[PDB]
Design a protein around this nucleic acid. Structure first.
Ligand SMILES: [Cl-]
Ligand SMILES: [K+]
Ligand SMILES: [Mg+2]
Ligand SMILES: [Mg+2]
Ligand SMILES: [Mg+2]
Ligand SMILES: [Mg+2]
Ligand SMILES: [Mg+2]
Ligand SMILES: [Mg+2]
Ligand SMILES: [Mg+2]
Ligand SMILES: [Mg+2]
Ligand SMILES: [Mg+2]
Ligand SMILES: [Mg+2]
Ligand SMILES: [Mg+2]
Ligand code: NA
Ligand code: NA
Ligand code: NA
Ligand code: NA
Ligand code: NA
Ligand SMILES: [Sr+2]
Ligand SMILES: [Sr+2]
Ligand SMILES: [Sr+2]
Ligand SMILES: [Sr+2]
Ligand SMILES: [Sr+2]
Ligand SMILES: [Sr+2]
Ligand SMILES: [Sr+2]
Ligand SMILES: [Sr+2]
Ligand SMILES: [Sr+2]
Ligand SMILES: [Sr+2]
Ligand SMILES: [Sr+2]
Ligand SMILES: [Sr+2]
Ligand SMILES: [Sr+2]
Ligand SMILES: [Sr+2]
Ligand SMILES: [Sr+2]
Ligand SMILES: [Sr+2]
Ligand SMILES: [Sr+2]
Ligand SMILES: [Sr+2]
Ligand SMILES: [Sr+2]
Ligand SMILES: [Sr+2]
Ligand SMILES: [Sr+2]
Ligand SMILES: [Sr+2]
Lengths: 132, 53, 337
RNA sequence: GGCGAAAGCCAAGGCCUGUCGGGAGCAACCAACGUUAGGGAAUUCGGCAAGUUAGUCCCGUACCUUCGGAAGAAGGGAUGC
RNA sequence: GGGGUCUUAAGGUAGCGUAGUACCUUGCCGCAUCAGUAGCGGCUUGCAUGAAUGGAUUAACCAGAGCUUCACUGUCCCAACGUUGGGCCCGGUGAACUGUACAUUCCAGUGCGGAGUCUGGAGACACCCAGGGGGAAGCAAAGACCCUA
RNA sequence: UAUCGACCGAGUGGCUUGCUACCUCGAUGUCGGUUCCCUCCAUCCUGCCCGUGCAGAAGCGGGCAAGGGUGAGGUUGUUCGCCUAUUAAAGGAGGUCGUGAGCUGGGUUUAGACCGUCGUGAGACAGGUCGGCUGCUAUCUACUGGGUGUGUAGGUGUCUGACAAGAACGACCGUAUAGUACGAGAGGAACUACGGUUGGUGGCCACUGGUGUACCGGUUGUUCGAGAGAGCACGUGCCGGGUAGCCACGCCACACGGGGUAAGAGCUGAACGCAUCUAAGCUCGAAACCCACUUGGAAAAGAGACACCGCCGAGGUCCCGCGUACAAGACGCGGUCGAUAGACUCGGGGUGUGCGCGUCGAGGUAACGAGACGUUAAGCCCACGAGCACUAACAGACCAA
């Protein structure tokens, strides 16, 4: 994938529960897999700000629940490092559901988004209200 | 740049930026400021802050 | 069916014993290309700080932007090249042929070796040139020593001596270059060998950590869950199978960890200068204040502060040199905090 | 002190005899502990081990039931000087 | 069991049922999970349920067996730092287990087919400290399994 | 004969199962897992190739090839297997079905108990079920690290390199190439140049993070009459902050190219006038082999080389102050021709505003009064740096060709 432009300390793992920062009808998402990741023995596959992950819907409308979908991590609590050394972290961990072509499935995004995510999923960033 | 908490200049290539739920952005010079800020303390009420002084 | 997994630690840095010489000994030198010139230098480690740099990678999206970079401050005062030792090629590799010395020696070189009182710089030079005529001349190296007296933060006065190969054009022009450097008094500087922005390999004896177990020393796991409570917290599963009935040297075991020699490839030289611009408020913790010839190496350098480190023109660089990076800022903030 | 023959602290009284000591910021490793960012049972046969909760007052309390119970259900609020 | 009685007197009623009883078996359908040889509900032809050899069912009770959820957490990702007592060095005190002999081994082979000791090579200067335990088919108890008397 | 492939026939392995009863009954602990190390190739991925029912993209099949990789999860004790999402791929096998003087103890397989079936009964079951223990101070050998001696045969310093170890590097995604070649279209490459991620590796601590029973502060109970200042509440009563140091969750570094080959593509070329990649010869060509790179390495018995100093004195030991070192030993630095350690003072840091006094303070006749402000960027403290010979590195003993 295109370089992020920041170093990331994965703050999530397979099994983590996170917020669904959009209006698709999904309130809570469970991380199942990390697109393009291969770990090592005994290591829980990790995910962080910027990754594309497969997720299952834990909380939300009946129609969305239990569905296995792709998403993009947009916010995380564990800090990330920017070129100038400054660290950046968020209030929560969030991901926006996205389709086969990486376009957000929902119409609106809720909450801020790391500018770095724009360097990959521009269509996601160009639906963001606030880009930090 | 100034630390949004105590108000001192922030040593370049240093500090952290906390991104609030609503989008607000708070630059912290040190862990100490973030931690006092978590205890719900107001920079003004602490005599050791440039803000207070 | 037991998942696969790489072995714990590398089998290429052993045996993991204590180093023989606290002073590093390169085991390879750069290629003979440019004009003649000494292929290495040395200094003493002081500590780290960071710097703000203008990205200069032509292929980077951030080219021209501020970028903070960690840096290790190395005090690098001038050294003395006291002799020109020549090697001859023999059926058993290279062997020291003879050496050419000077008269003017640092006032305290008499703390390490027995300074020469009666020497013959020509009888030697002649032997060397005769050898070169016969075509039995292997490379030429300069016996080199530091002047820790120029460094107040370092308690020692007793110089550190090391051989440094001379590389360059033709062996003849090279031999003459070497001889001139020595004859003088030997004195030379980091400037003479390096330019800021070039890549250098840094060698040094890592920090010592005494004896340590398999976990820290080899990176083996700690017993997990219930296994961590029955009496074995950080002891490997087994020393080996039933057969072969013996313990292979490859199974991770406790022992000396640290104080080994390591040669760290491609370290970018951010800036060469002199003075006290890179010192830190309050002084570098466990070292002192810098105010003299110094070097800023990008990243880390093996060994604790005060340890002698060695420089050498990168032998296997991966990038082309981007000379004289633009240093917009150099932190002087106290390291205590 | 507190509900208390509870804890904790302290008298009267007893003791330094749950009787080998001296050294090394005192390494590895072990016993028994403290603290750990983000994630939060992914560990394991199994949440084993640890932890969470916690005293008291007010509000409030489901299914089921042998009408006794369930019940401190759950849930919420208060608490010093 | 056979057929639309036969054995051996009767021929399984009410229940319950893949059971702590169901071999086949992870039975089939459903719930729950990203995925559930589990658990629960239903079906049920029950290899081989069933009425004081008690059946069914059941509030309360339980350091009894299994399952799920919320909360929490170094159980784990993945380990780190620290505390106390040991460990290590020194004075003093001072055992035991074990011992055919020899013994610096290693890779192969051979041999009663599982060798430090045989064969052929390889390696090997001696002694000491600390370590975790690969081997001595380690030490411990004339195998309790199995057969024989 | 792209691909699939019956019958029948010939084999190799020693992974399954069976047979045998050679070894062991004065004991070789069982399944599964786990942890840690080596290996095999009948190759799942990665590299290089051939064929195609090969346009392309992608498949399918075959060849060389064991450098590296082959992961996370749901039921089940499971091995196995079924299932889910990731993946370049999530290959199989050997090591006493590697691994219990390493762990676990869920299954098996004692003594308790229930069910079904069988038995007149005791009781049984190659059925199910709940419960049910894991000893030992390492003598030798083995290896990981550390020392003392002897040999080579006065000392200091620098080297050499026989050999030895390495995966020190493996893999992926993305961009330009390019919506291009190819193709009606749909679809859709590559060489090469770049950016990044992942797994592995070595190191480091400016940054972020953890710790930090140094330290500073808040505060509960109780004891010292109150105040001040303290002890105890387990090796901090509890709580907040946290320097150094150590750390990872942080940060830095880990080629390019040569050489020789395999499969394969070829040249020249005969036997065989032609043909023929092969027989002699030659040009190429794999993540594999060698080198390059890193680490060890004068005990390499051919026991090494160089330079200087010294043989009445070079150098070393003891001693003393110490740590860039450390379990003993070892290693490194300084020793008045001195900043080696401490005191002191600055600096740089940690806490967070001291004792006392003054004013204010709901009230209360008053006494009394939780607390607020000022004095006070205060007080207290520092495993760091600098200055500084004040104190202590003194005095001095010895070996030595
Ligand atoms: Cl996954
Ligand atoms: K036996
Ligand atoms: Mg595992
Ligand atoms: Mg610091
Ligand atoms: Mg800081
Ligand atoms: Mg598991
Ligand atoms: Mg009856
Ligand atoms: Mg017998
Ligand atoms: Mg093959
Ligand atoms: Mg076995
Ligand atoms: Mg064993
Ligand atoms: Mg055992
Ligand atoms: Mg034992
Ligand atoms: Na009382
Ligand atoms: Na096993
Ligand atoms: Na391979
Ligand atoms: Na499984
Ligand atoms: Na066995
Ligand atoms: Sr195994
Ligand atoms: Sr070498
Ligand atoms: Sr046990
Ligand atoms: Sr054996
Ligand atoms: Sr008393
Ligand atoms: Sr006594
Ligand atoms: Sr703390
Ligand atoms: Sr669980
Ligand atoms: Sr599980
Ligand atoms: Sr409550
Ligand atoms: Sr031991
Ligand atoms: Sr082969
Ligand atoms: Sr392939
Ligand atoms: Sr099965
Ligand atoms: Sr068991
Ligand atoms: Sr001899
Ligand atoms: Sr592309
Ligand atoms: Sr198209
Ligand atoms: Sr205490
Ligand atoms: Sr409490
Ligand atoms: Sr060929
Ligand atoms: Sr020698």
């Amino acid at each position: 994938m295109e370089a992020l432009g920041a170093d990331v300390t994965q703050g999530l793992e397979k099994g983590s529960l996170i917020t669904c920062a959009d209006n698709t009808g999904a309130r809570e998402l469970k991380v199942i897999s990390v697109h393009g990741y291969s770990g090592t023995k005994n290591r829980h596959p990790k995910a962080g700000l910027g990754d594309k992950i497969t997720v299952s819907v834990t909380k939300g409308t009946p129609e969305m629940r239990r569905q296995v979908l792709e998403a993009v991590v947009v916010r995380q609590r564990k800090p990330i490092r920017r070129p100038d050394g400054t660290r950046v972290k968020f209030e929560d961990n969030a991901a926006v559901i996205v389709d086969e072509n990486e376009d957000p499935r929902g119409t609106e995004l809720k909450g801020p988004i790391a500018r770095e995510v724009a360097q990959r999923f521009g269509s996601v960033a160009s639906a963001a209200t606030m880009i930090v | 740049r100034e630390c949004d908490y105590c108000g001192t200049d922030i040593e370049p290539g240093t500090g952290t930026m906390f991104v609030h739920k609503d989008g607000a952005t708070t630059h912290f010079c040190s862990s100490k400021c973030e931690n006092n800020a978590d205890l719900g303390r107001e920079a003004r009420n602490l005599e050791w802050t440039d803000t207070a002084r | 069916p037991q998942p696969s997994r790489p072995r714990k630690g590398s089998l290429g840095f052993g045996p993991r014993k204590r180093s023989t010489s606290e002073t590093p000994r390169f085991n390879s030198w750069p290629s003979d290309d440019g004009q003649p010139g000494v292929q290495g230098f040395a200094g003493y480690k002081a500590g780290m700080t960071h710097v703000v740099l203008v990205n200069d990678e032509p292929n980077s999206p951030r080219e021209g932007m501020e970028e903070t970079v960690p840096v290790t401050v190395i005090e690098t005062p001038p050294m003395r090249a006291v002799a020109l030792r020549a090697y001859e090629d023999t059926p058993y590799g290279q062997r020291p042929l003879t050496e050419v010395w000077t008269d003017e020696f640092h006032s305290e070189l008499d703390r390490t070796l027995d300074v020469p009182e009666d020497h013959d710089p020509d009888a030697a030079e002649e032997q060397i040139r005769d050898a070169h005529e016969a075509g039995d001349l292997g490379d030429l190296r300069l016996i080199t020593h530091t002047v820790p007296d120029a460094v107040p933060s370092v308690p020692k006065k007793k110089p550190d001596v090391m051989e440094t190969r001379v590389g360059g054009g033709s062996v003849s022009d090279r031999l003459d270059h070497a001889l001139d450097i020595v004859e003088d008094g030997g004195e030379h500087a980091m400037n003479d060998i390096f330019r800021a922005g070039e890549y250098a390999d840094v060698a040094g004896v890592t920090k010592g950590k005494g004896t340590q177990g398999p976990v820290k020393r080899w990176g083996v796991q700690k017993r997990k869950g219930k296994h961590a409570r029955q009496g074995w917290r950080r002891r490997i599963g087994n020393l080996g199978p039933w057969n072969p009935s013996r313990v292979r040297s490859t199974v991770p075991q406790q022992g000396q960890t640290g104080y080994h020699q390591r040669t760290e490839l491609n370290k970018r030289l951010i800036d060469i200068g002199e003075g006290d611009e890179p010192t830190v408020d309050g002084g570098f913790v466990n070292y002192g204040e810098v105010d003299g010839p110094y070097t800023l190496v990008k990243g880390s350098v093996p060994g604790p502060d005060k340890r002698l480190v060695r420089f050498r023109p990168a032998v296997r660089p991966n990038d082309q040199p981007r000379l004289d990076p633009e240093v917009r800022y150099v932190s002087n903030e106290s390291n205590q905090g």
